[PDB]
Design a protein around this nucleic acid. Sequence first.
DNA 1: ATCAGAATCCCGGTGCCGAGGCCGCTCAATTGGTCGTAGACAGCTCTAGCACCGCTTAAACGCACGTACGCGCTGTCCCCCGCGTTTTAACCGCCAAGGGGATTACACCCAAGA
Length: 66
Amino acid sequence: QRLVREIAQDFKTDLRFQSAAIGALQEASEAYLVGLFEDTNLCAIHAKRVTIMPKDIQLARRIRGE
DNA sequence: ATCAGAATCCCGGTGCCGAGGCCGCTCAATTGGTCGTAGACAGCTCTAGCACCGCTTAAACGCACGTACGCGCTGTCCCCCGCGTTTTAACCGCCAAGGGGATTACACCCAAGA
């Protein structure tokens, strides 16, 4: 919640947030991170490796189009 | 280091079908006027958001030691890297299947209708 407020402050000052909105943001961020970690593990296994590396995340984000 | 070699870019050169300029309307855009409801503004409110304290505790960071996943280097033989030959994806002229004019010689005579 603190990170969300600090990020939203850079876009518009004096902003309020509801509990449902914060929960939805947290759920969406967790799902996106889980998907990114799945893609990272897939890329690491494809490279004959077990431990994940930032190169795996970069390749996943480049293939996904982010 | 150094050269011979096939592969690549720019220049005379050219013309032609695509890019570019012009004419007549006419159907969409503009003007003017009459309804009129969804939009802008003021007011009451209380719920929802915000800041702070009391007490609690499992989560997060520093420590100890080695190891196994991480990564450089080696032996192999492999299946693509690349050239030479037509061929398979279609593109391009003469056979032996029939539809038709032509004939039954030459000259003469008789009979009977429009």
